[PDB]
Design a protein around this nucleic acid. Structure first.
Ligand SMILES: [K+]
Ligand SMILES: [Mg+2]
Ligand SMILES: [Mg+2]
Ligand SMILES: [Mg+2]
Ligand SMILES: [Mg+2]
Length: 52
RNA sequence: GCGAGCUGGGUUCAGAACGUCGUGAGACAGUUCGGUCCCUAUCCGUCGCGGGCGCAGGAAAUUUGAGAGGAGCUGUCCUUAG
């Protein structure tokens, strides 16, 4: 029975860690996008259209 | 420079879709098809046209020009001369 409890406990911990890593990957991706968005906010379109 | 002068193709309303992201409503680090352009000009300004008076009498013509505007471009060939 102790073996099974350890196995169940180990499995459940891994599931949680996968969730955490998933969300951190999301955050990293969204950050990168946000920085690029702000960086490109001023550099799009032709000269005249930038001045709009 | 110029939308009370015109257009409205791009983009940034509401629809819909692709890629991608999000558990999601939705979103762009990307695209795509469709999407109401209102106003009778008072004043100055600008382009034309009149009326009034003035210009030491009242008229009909012809004029000077202070001043203002307009115009202001350029090719090729022949000759000089192979
Ligand atoms: K998804
Ligand atoms: Mg963008
Ligand atoms: Mg105007
Ligand atoms: Mg349009
Ligand atoms: Mg005024």
């Amino acid at each position: 029975e102790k073996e099974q409890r350890i196995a169940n406990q180990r499995h459940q911990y891994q599931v949680q860690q996968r969730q955490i890593e998933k969300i951190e990957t999301q955050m990293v991706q969204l950050k990168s996008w946000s920085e690029k968005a702000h960086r490109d906010s001023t550099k799009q379109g032709s000269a005249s259209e930038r001045r709009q």
